[PDB]
Structure formats: structure tokens, C-alpha cells
């Protein structure tokens, strides 16, 4: 997150870290056994870290659980980034409490101008690298599909939306992929891609979660 703020410990209790000997992407807990992330975060052997604040120090409220299955969308397109959504089933159910909690899936798609919370442990610098110890948060509005396609001509599909600030300085960045975009307590987006980070007229692009609720439910039922 560039231009964000320290969230506060466990204030985003559905935020998870995906770890492979280092933090490499985020995700969102949607029930005791399943996490939503981005398909471009797929790899074998993912370890899911729940209850985290300082990702570099074990503080006491963490639950580490290995992924048993990591299921990319069956039509994920690694070039266009269409359908950039992945479901991770946990080897054992997480213990849900105040600091580890699921986030609701949407019942409708959100509208432009709606304010959302974007979070992660990604880079805090738009040109360089500085990775935070603690979780960072950003409040950002959904932009109109018109503005999104103007920023990214030919590159935005029906399963993507833009959120952020066209003036630059405030955006998700490397290490935030797969994490949540929450609007009015509903998981509306997944950090996916952009042209760099926090650059003028290049807002973040996010997977449109509302289009996948049926696929999510069927996948949970079939695994």
C-alpha cells in the first residue's frame, strides 16, 4: 500500500498473508476453511497466515495453516488477467474469533464512487522498495468503468474495476495482490494489477468479486 495508514493490530481480521518463506500475496477469509486470493498468486505449498499484524514477528494471535487446495478460476487468463481469482481451501478449519473473522460476499455489485478499504503488506513506495512490518490500509473510491477504460485502453474486462486516485500517490502495490477491497462490509474486489503503482492516471485494477459468487459457492460445495 502506497499512501496508506497503519491499520492497527487485527483491525482487518479477514486479511490473510500467503507465505512461501516470505510474504508474497494477500487474501481474504470467507469462511473457516476458505480464502479468496488472485489466480496470479497461485503456487504449490502455500502457507496461510491468519491473525497477523507484524508479519516479521510471532506475536501470539496468529494461526498458520497450510493450503490443502489452491484452485484458480478455470478460465483465468495469465496474459489479459481476466478471471484473476483463486480459492484456497485450508488443511484444517481456522478458529474464528475477534482477530480471525470471515468477510461477507456481496449480494450486489458496488457502484462507482463507493468508498472501500484496501489493505496489505505490500510495498509502500511507488518507485523503489520498502516493505512494512505491520498491515497498511487505504481508503479509496471505486472509479467509473469509463475512467477505468480511459486509463487502460483495451485492457479492462467486465470482470475488472478500477479504484483509487487519478492524481497518484495512493494505491495498492507489489505484495498486496490477492488481498481485499471491502465496501460497506462486503468483499467487492481482489488486488490484481496496474501500470506501476500510485502513478498519475494509472489507478489500481481489481477483480470484480460480485461476478464470481456462484462459482465460489459451487467450488466450496465441490471441494
Amino acid at each position: 500500500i502506497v499512501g496508506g495508514y497503519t491499520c492497527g493490530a487485527n483491525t482487518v481480521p479477514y486479511q490473510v498473508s500467503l507465505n512461501s518463506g516470505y510474504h508474497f500475496c494477500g487474501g481474504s477469509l470467507i469462511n473457516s476453511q476458505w480464502v479468496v486470493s488472485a489466480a496470479h498468486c497461485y503456487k504449490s505449498g502455500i502457507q496461510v497466515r491468519l491473525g497477523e499484524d507484524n508479519i516479521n514477528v510471532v506475536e501470539g494471535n496468529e494461526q498458520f495453516i497450510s493450503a490443502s487446495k489452491s484452485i484458480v478460476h478455470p478460465s483465468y487468463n495469465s496474459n489479459t488477467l481476466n478471471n484473476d481469482i483463486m480459492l484456497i481451501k485450508l488443511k484444517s478449519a481456522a478458529s474464528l474469533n475477534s482477530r480471525v473473522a470471515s468477510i461477507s460476499l456481496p449480494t450486489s455489485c458496488a457502484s462507482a464512487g463507493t468508498q472501500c478499504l484496501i489493505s496489505g503488506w505490500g510495498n509502500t513506495k511507488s518507485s523503489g522498495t520498502s516493505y512494512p512490518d505491520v498491515l497498511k490500509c487505504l481508503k479509496a473510491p471505486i472509479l467509473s468503468d469509463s475512467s477505468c477504460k480511459s486509463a487502460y485502453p483495451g485492457q479492462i474486462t467486465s470482470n475488472m474495476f478500477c479504484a483509487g486516485y487519478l492524481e497518484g500517490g495512493k494505491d495498492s502495490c507489489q505484495g498486496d495482490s490477492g488481498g481485499p477491497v471491502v465496501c460497506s462490509g462486503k468483499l467487492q474486489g481482489i488486488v490484481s494489477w496496474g501500470s506501476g503503482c500510485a502513478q498519475k492516471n494509472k489507478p489500481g485494477v481489481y477483480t470484480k468479486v460480485c461476478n464470481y459468487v456462484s462459482w465460489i459457492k459451487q467450488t466450496i460445495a465441490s471441494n
Binding site: 516470505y22 496470479h40 488477467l81 505490500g122 485492457q155 495498492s172 507489489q174 498486496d176 494489477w193
Partner: peptide, 14 residues
């Protein structure tokens, strides 16, 4: 010019 936000990122010439 399109780049994912993973560690490491995949970023294309477009």
C-alpha cells in the same frame, strides 16, 4: 505496462 502486484511481480511490455 501491465504489472501484477505479487512478489515478485509479472509486468509486461504493454
Amino acid at each position: 505496462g501491465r504489472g501484477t502486484k505479487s512478489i515478485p511481480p509479472i509486468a509486461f511490455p504493454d
